[PDB]
Design a binder for these strands. Structure first.
Ligand SMILES: [Mg+2]
Ligand SMILES: [Zn+2]
Lengths: 1095, 91, 98, 49, 97, 49, 147
DNA sequence: GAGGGTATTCGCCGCCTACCTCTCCTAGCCCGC
DNA sequence: GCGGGCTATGGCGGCGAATACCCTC
RNA sequence: CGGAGAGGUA
């Protein structure tokens, strides 16, 4: 039909979609918001759980307090308990915290009650628990003014996990189990070779498991009773080198805490303490449910216990032995049977998602345990009848752990704000590498893979292209996280061959049990497939045909496995996985162009990808615009209320990119609730527009577009077709310091008058002055209590552009400044960067390249009608890389730009029978959409190329094949053969040449080793690596290598004399001794080794 | 191994992956076939004493040289009995 | 041999260093775990940065200031005890802890 | 490492279905990851040589 | 333009897997902000034009420039030291043409 | 001991060299690079310099 | 006996004595090779070396005072153990027991660490170098150039 | 038991180069003015 | 009462040496 | 400009 009906102001973007849409894409940021409002226990989460989890709605803070409280002494004569966590209004609004530097947080209060167990006296208080960082409406925590995103983490779900490794001597199964606890102690039970079953409690020596049972008091008769079928455990029983119970108890204590009297009593106490407690060992409800499901112990009773039990361990061992030998299921008493099978720790049922709520809860948990130890300590060193709740509670650990998490964690990541899509993709990332997760250096090749359980939960595309290949995924479009933490993906319950609605959100485990059906399958609108054989992921991700009676469930859309940035690639199924991955990772790098243009051939996941990203100002409630200006819309509601939306004009994103927002409504229009009322950085009428539509030719041209390079027309430079605005943020502060008196003054000591012209009376450059590199921005003096160094902030190396805004925070104005400062002046310099040679334009299909030449518009291949092509892409890049989707995009872009009219004079064409109406005729510049896996077929492209409208005169410049007859503007003669032309959507990546060019003759040098400094920031010099010395040695060039390593790097006298020699006419001096070698000699001596240089 | 790991264990001469035994003296072979092992015994055509390669896993395949290795087949002073890779030190 | 350096080298030698060699290397002893005074922002005395052990922190400038001119060169300060020379000496001299 | 017995039956011109594309990504990601790890290993081998 | 005339400049690309990863060319000023690399040395440097960067090094001593002009000049390095096959051979667009 | 120390296992090489009191004849390429003297190869051979 | 002879003959053949393994003095690296950076705001960052040197000096002074003032042999032995551990941490931190960790539970860079790994002196400052008269830009194809 | 011959286990070492951007670099507490 | 200084368990392979288990005198 | 962490380019 068209784009959609859900969005009121949706542009009329017709779609080539054949299949319908049983479900609408959920809120894309809903994962973070709905996992944090669970943490703070907002009413909305309570309502959400009411129609589902009404049995026990408890928040994260409430759960932490319930697990912690009560806190009682050894005698039990007193107690401390918490309850009803409470939040107040945020101290300042989001913009204020972002501007100043305040974190966006709200107070947290808890009702603490102290009860004395020998007087009945109860003292209650409301204790302030610190300022709790809050989440904005998007999913971002503002920390120290900077905007951060807490990335979800794919940890391993705690619980029992078997496997079937193969030995080298026995060459049998060596089934090993590890009861992986949350904050617990590992109690592995391997099947060690030679038909021996053993334990490896914690990481200590491997005592047998019959020893563990003897420590449990189990009789050998009871063991061999419940272990009778097991020959291996019987062997480990009679062959155990241990008898009684005290022997085993003492044996465990020998390793638990060596160097202490291993009394039987202490062994019993520790045996109970390590595993069967709930204050040193907590499987957590997520782990407990997993264990119960795996062993089928308690199917009915609700989960109200997070500590192991004797039944758990004995069932673990029984399952282990039954897995050994060769069983198919087990029937442990008091529980339903469960199949015997190993565990794949890659399967998404065996690895869960620590959303932001879970991570913040865990850090609060460790802070609260630190406070609990302090309160227990102070519970015995203060006299009774003087203790009150407020005198025992020290908040410091909690407020410290919260800051520790939000400042110094791998998951609290600086948000990516290159373009509206980068942030939205950051907020929906599944990073498998955090504290408690895999390590990048250590992670192998079995984790860095695509699992068949990733279908519809993690995108098999859109992965980092470097060392993070596979450790950082992206959450699929329709996926959501269940209360435990596992991910679920919508399906469409098909019943008796009828593809019925009532979508059910299946998880990975239950997904395995049933048989899922592909939504692209031909449902005939009558609840019955056309052909009986439809491919389905059988059990272990085995695609196979099957009869309609076997099929259990169905996908929601042909577009469910892909993520939000991979769903914006048109003709995705025509690209190879590598190039689609490159394109998905590139759509997150396109810079916001000064003007935006939505694709002619987009997919459809661009209006929602912008209204769910939070950069388009969606109207809160329906109403009529009253006054619309560049800086404020004022919706006059249908109830007399006015809600003015303020537009953030020319702001700075996390990556120096402009954040323009402009209204797209008139003063008389009527808007509806949910309508886009203003554009954003990369947006056109509410849809993502990360690039521009350019006329492209696919010919090789004089070698300038050689080996992935690009040739651009000069029109893209003169017309600002690709002209991005960037803004840089320069800051400087005047610290109080011990000496005192630091002041931002205008008069610069030992300075010229002309250079001081720009600075205003205060000493700050006047806004609107083009501060070129080297110019003064803020004259700052350093009163080293005249002892005043003119350490003035200047336009850094490689900066330019006008000064658009100054922000100064004064102590005299009672501002929230850091400790020991008076002023925190800050400046913004903005610069418009046109596209030049070296910038890295790239389409959506992975066809990246760097502009090799910008030809003048005169000498460009021009069509028969004189229109010069805007860009030329080499032919040799397409067929090799298996990204033909770009060619189809080019053809459909030409069709959309030209407009068409299928002539149904006598019956519709055969190739257009299933083409939707409103697509049989399109006016010029008609934006279309081809959904990612259900779009324009090849025959339809052929037809729409066969019928297109003339341009101005009755001349069709592009024939049926799609190739035009171009004229070489450089020589004049027409090219001998027709050339493929069309309109392709390409994006200017944030890899401009202006940030990469860099050179050094001399400058700052390192301090410890006197080598030059590193980095383009402080001048710095490129590193002559170890393997660039091997090349020079292989060349035999000795003098060049010697000079490079001595008189250019760390021969200070050599360096200065070389400079003097070059500036004068004298020959280049001889080298000396590397300062690095002397540093090494001193360090070797410092170790305690009399290194000496004999003669 | 048949790639970069093979090159690494070659230049490091570690102990390949499967140390396929190699002949030590010329003469006929009296191989017997079992499970998880063989009995590749080489008669000392030189006139000394027989060579023994018995418990070496039968899962490892034999090698074809000049004729597939078999009982009665003649093996030279350094002909390899199994197939795959040989330990650089023993050769 | 060869003292500091100068490219006539051959046979760079290493070996275990005896306490006598260690005490010969050091130009003093460090017996106070201090680094620098905050108020004056100058090195402490007998610390890990003592100018009397490692050398001047400024070119031809004693700790007390009795000498700050080039002509005064090589004289050990009578008052503060730091040797007057170029600041680069702080890269070479070592201390030892008894 | 074993072959999928389906197999992929549509070229990149006709456009792969959802399952075919998924099972193709299966093998593509392994290639990318092994490329990264093998360049890491080859650097060390070259240094030792 | 007079100063840089006939002064070799060693262009380096990382990783410098083999000897020809460092080669010395003759610098020519070009309008822009990107080093212009002759298409034939791409195979030697293993360098394409999808965003790759390269380091530039300038030898100073008369000895150093002699190495850069004789030992390391690109035109003198046409054969691969590994096998002796030519590396400044036409490829891609040149082969098609 | 300098080349071996710079290659790998610096602590083991340095301690065993210290025990054995090994003297390093600076005759290699890596060592002449470390001390910043002409490498005994190519245009560093006594014949050519 | 062969493994032991490998170490015994080393001391036998040469004039060096095995008494160099036991230290009576400990050398202090020059300050400029272990400097402190005075960032604006009094944010003086002390290299990991200075912290360990301070630990050793503190314990040495403690043990010196305890011996000078007299103390039971048990306390003096405990202090000598702590001094031994401090010196062991200074030379090679984390080799024995729990590494001496500083702010935010990170082990400290001992003297042994300045000479090890890809970050150590040997493979960072000696083999590879940083050089002036050097620059870096993006490359584009120039087809009008000559080889 | 000593002793030796075999295994068995744990500690250590190693894991491409080059470059760009960003954010944090302590916390608790005890003594002094 | 507030400021400043002083102290405090998802890597993996190779390899060697520091050490369990069993026959012999 | 020293350390730790994160992201990214080839
Ligand atoms: Mg490239
Ligand atoms: Zn003085």
């Amino acid at each position: 039909s068209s784009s959609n009906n859900s969005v009121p102001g949706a542009p009329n973007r017709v779609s080539f979609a054949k299949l319908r849409e049983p479900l609408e894409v959920p809120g894309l940021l809903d994962v973070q918001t709905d996992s944090f409002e669970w943490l703070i226990g907002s009413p909305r989460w309570r309502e959400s759980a009411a129609e589902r989890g009404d049995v026990n709605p408890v928040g994260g803070l409430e759960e932490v307090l319930y697990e912690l409280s009560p806190i009682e002494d050894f005698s039990g004569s007193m107690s401390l308990s918490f309850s009803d966590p409470r939040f107040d209004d945020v101290k300042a609004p989001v913009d204020e915290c972002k501007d100043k530097d305040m974190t966006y947080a709200a107070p947290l209060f808890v009702t603490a009650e102290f009860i004395n167990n020998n007087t009945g006296e109860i003292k209650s208080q409301t204790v302030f628990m610190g300022d709790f960082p809050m989440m904005t409406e998007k999913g971002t925590f503002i920390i120290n003014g900077t905007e951060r995103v807490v990335v979800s983490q794919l940890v391993r779900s705690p619980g029992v996990y078997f496997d079937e490794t193969i030995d080298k001597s026995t060459d049998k199964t060596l089934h090993s189990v590890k009861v992986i606890p949350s904050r617990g102690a590992w109690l592995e039970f391997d099947v060690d070779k030679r038909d021996t079953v053993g334990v490896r409690i914690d990481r200590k020596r491997r005592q047998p498991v019959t020893v563990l049972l003897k420590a449990l008091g189990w009789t050998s008769e009871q063991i061999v009773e419940r272990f009778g079928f097991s020959e291996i455990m019987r062997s480990t029983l009679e062959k155990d080198n241990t008898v009684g119970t005290d022997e085993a108890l003492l044996d465990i204590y020998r390793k638990l805490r060596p160097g202490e009297p291993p009394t039987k009593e202490s062994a019993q106490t520790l045996l109970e303490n390590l595993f069967f407690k709930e204050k040193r060992y907590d499987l957590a409800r997520v782990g407990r449910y997993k264990v119960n499901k795996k062993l089928g112990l308690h199917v009915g009773e609700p989960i109200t216990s997070s500590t192991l039990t004797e039944e758990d361990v004995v069932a673990t061992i029984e399952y282990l032995v039954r897995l050994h030998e060769g069983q198919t299921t087990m029937t442990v008493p008091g529980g339903v049977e469960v199949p015997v099978e190993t565990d794949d720790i890659d399967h998404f049922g065996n690895r869960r998602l620590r959303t932001v709520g879970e991570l913040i809860q865990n850090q609060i948990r460790v802070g609260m345990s630190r406070m609990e130890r302090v309160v227990r300590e102070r519970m015995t060193t203060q006299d009774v009848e003087a203790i009150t709740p407020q005198t025992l509670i020290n908040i410091r650990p909690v407020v410290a752990a919260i800051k520790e998490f939000f400042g110094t964690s791998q998951l609290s990541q600086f948000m990516d704000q290159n373009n509206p899509l980068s942030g939205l993709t950051h907020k929906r990332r599944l990073s498998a590498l955090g504290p408690g997760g895999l390590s990048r250096e250590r992670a192998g090749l079995e984790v860095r893979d695509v699992h068949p359980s990733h279908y519809g939960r993690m995108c098999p595309i859109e992965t980092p292209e470097g060392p993070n290949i596979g450790l950082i995924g992206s959450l699929s479009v329709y996926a959501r996280v269940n209360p435990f933490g596992f991910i679920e993906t919508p399906y469409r319950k098909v019943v008796d061959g009828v593809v019925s609605d009532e979508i059910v959100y299946l998880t990975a485990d239950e997904e395995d049990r049933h048989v899922v059906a592909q939504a692209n399958s031909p449902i005939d609108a009558d609840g019955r497939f056309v052909e009986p054989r439809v491919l389905v992921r059988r059990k272990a991700g085995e695609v196979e045909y099957v009869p309609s009676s076997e099929v259990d469930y169905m996908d929601v859309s042909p577009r469910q496995m892909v993520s939000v940035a991979t769903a914006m690639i048109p003709f995705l199924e025509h690209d190879d996985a590598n190039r689609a991955l490159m394109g998905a990772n590139m759509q997150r790098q396109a810079v916001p162009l000064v003007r935006s243009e939505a694709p002619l051939v987009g997919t459809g996941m661009e209006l929602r990808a912008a209204i769910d990203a939070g950069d388009v100002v969606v109207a809160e409630e329906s109403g009529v615009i009253e006054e619309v200006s560049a800086d404020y819309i004022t919706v006059m509601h249908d109830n007399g209320t006015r809600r003015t939306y303020r537009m953030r004009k020319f702001a700075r994103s996390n990556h120096g990119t402009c954040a323009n927002q402009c209204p797209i409504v008139d003063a008389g229009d009527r808007v509806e609730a949910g309508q886009v009322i203003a554009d954003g950085p990369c947006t056109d009428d509410g849809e993502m527009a990360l690039g521009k539509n350019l006329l492209v030719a696919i010919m090789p041209w004089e070698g300038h577009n050689y080996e992935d390079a690009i040739i651009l027309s000069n029109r893209l430079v003169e017309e600002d077709v690709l002209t991005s605005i960037h803004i840089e943020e320069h800051e400087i502060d005047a610290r109080d310091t011990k000496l005192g008196a630091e002041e931002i003054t205008r008069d610069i000591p030992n300075i010229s008058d002309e250079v001081l012209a720009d600075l205003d009376e205060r000493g700050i450059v006047r806004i609107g002055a083009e501060v070129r590199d080297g110019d003064i921005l803020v004259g700052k003096v350093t009163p080293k209590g005249r002892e005043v160094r003119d350490t003035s902030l200047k336009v850094p190396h490689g900066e330019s552009g006008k000064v658009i805004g100054i922000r100064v925070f004064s102590r005299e104005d009672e501002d929230e400044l850091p400790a020991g400062v008076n002023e925190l002046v800050r400046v913004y310099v903005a610069q418009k960067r046109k596209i030049s040679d070296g910038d890295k334009l790239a389409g959506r299909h992975g066809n990246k390249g760097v502009i090799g030449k910008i030809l003048p518009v005169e000498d460009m291949p021009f069509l028969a009608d004189g229109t010069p092509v805007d860009i030329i892409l080499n032919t040799h890049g397409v067929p090799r890389r298996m990204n033909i989707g770009q060619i189809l995009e080019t053809h459909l872009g030409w069709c959309a730009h030209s407009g068409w009219k299928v002539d149904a004079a006598k019956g519709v064409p055969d190739w257009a029978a299933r083409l939707p109406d409103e697509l049989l005729e399109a006016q010029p510049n008609a934006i279309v959409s081809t959904p990612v896996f259900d779009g324009a077929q090849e025959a339809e492209l052929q037809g729409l190329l066969s019928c297109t409208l003339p341009n101005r005169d009755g001349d069709v410049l592009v024939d049926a094949d799609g190739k035009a007859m171009l004229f070489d503007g450089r020589s004049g003669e027409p090219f001998p053969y027709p050339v493929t032309v069309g309109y392709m959507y390409i994006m200017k990546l944030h890899h401009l040449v202006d940030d990469k060019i860099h050179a050094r003759s001399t400058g700052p040098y390192s301090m410890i080793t006197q080598q030059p400094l590193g980095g383009k920031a402080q001048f710095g010099g490129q590193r002559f690596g170890e393997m660039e010395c091997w090349a020079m040695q292989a060349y035999g060039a000795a003098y060049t290598l010697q000079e490079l390593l001595t008189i250019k790097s760390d021969d200070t006298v050599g360096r200065v004399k070389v400079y003097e020699a070059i500036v004068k006419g004298e020959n280049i001096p001889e080298p000396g001794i590397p300062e690095s070698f002397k540093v090494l000699l001193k360090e070797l001596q410092s170790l305690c080794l009399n290194v000496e240089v004999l003669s | 191994t048949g790639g970069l790991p093979r090159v690494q264990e070659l230049f490091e001469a570690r102990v390949p992956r499967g140390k396929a035994p190699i002949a030590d003296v010329t003469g006929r072979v009296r191989l017997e076939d079992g499970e998880r092992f063989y009995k590749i015994t080489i008669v000392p055509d030189d006139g000394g004493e027989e060579v023994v390669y018995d418990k070496i896993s039968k899962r490892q395949r034999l090698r074809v040289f000049k004729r597939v290795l078999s009982d009665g087949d003649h093996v030279e002073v350094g002909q390899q009995l199994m197939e795959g890779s040989a330990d650089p030190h023993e050769v | 041999g060869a003292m500091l350096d100068v490219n006539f080298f051959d046979e760079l030698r290493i070996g275990l260093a005896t306490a006598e060699d260690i005490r010969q290397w050091s130009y003093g002893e460090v017996k106070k775990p201090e680094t620098i005074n905050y108020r004056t922002l100058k090195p402490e005395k007998d610390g890990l940065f003592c100018e009397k052990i490692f050398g001047p922190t400024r070119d031809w400038e004693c700790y007390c200031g009795k000498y700050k001119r080039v002509r005064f060169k090589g004289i050990i300060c009578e008052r503060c005890g730091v040797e007057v020379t170029r600041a680069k000496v702080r890269r070479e001299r070592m201390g030892h802890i008894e | 490492g074993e072959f999928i017995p389906r197999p992929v039956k549509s070229s990149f011109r006709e456009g792969l279905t959802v399952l075919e594309y998924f099972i193709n990504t299966h093998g593509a990601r392994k290639g990318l990851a092994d490329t990264a790890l093998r360049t890491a290993d080859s650097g060390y081998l070259t240094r030792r040589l | 333009e007079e100063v840089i005339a006939e002064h070799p400049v060693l262009l380096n690309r990382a990783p410098t897997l083999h000897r020809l990863g460092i080669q010395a060319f003759e610098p020519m000023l070009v309008e822009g902000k990107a080093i212009q690399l002759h298409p034939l040395v791409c195979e030697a440097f293993n360098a394409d034009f999808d965003g790759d960067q390269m380091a530039v090094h300038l030898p100073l001593s008369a000895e150093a420039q002699a190495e850069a002009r004789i030992l390391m000049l690109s035109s003198n390095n046409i054969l691969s030291p590994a096998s002796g096959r030519p590396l400044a051979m036409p490829r891609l667009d040149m082969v098609t043409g | 001991w300098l080349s071996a120390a710079s290659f790998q296992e610096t602590t083991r090489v340095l301690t065993d060299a210290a025990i054995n009191c090994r003297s390093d004849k600076l005759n290699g390429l890596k060592e002449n690079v470390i001390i910043g003297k002409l490498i005994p190869a190519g245009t560093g051979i006594n014949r050519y310099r | 006996a062969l493994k032991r002879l490998k170490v015994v003959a080393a001391f036998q053949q040469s004039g060096n004595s095995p008494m160099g393994m036991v230290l009576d003095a400990v050398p202090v690296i020059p300050p400029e090779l272990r400097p402190m950076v005075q960032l604006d705001g009094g944010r003086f960052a002390t290299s990991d070396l200075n912290d360990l040197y301070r630990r050793v000096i503190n314990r040495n002074n403690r043990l010196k005072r305890l011996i000078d003032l007299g103390a039971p042999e048990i306390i003096v032995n405990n202090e000598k153990r702590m001094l031994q551990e401090s010196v062991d941490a200074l030379f090679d931190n984390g080799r024995r027991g729990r590494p001496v960790t500083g702010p935010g539970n990170r082990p400290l860079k001992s003297l042994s660490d300045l000479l090890k790994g890809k970050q150590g002196r040997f493979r960072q400052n000696l083999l590879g170098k940083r050089v002036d008269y050097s620059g870096r830009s993006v490359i584009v194809v120039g087809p009008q150039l000559k080889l």
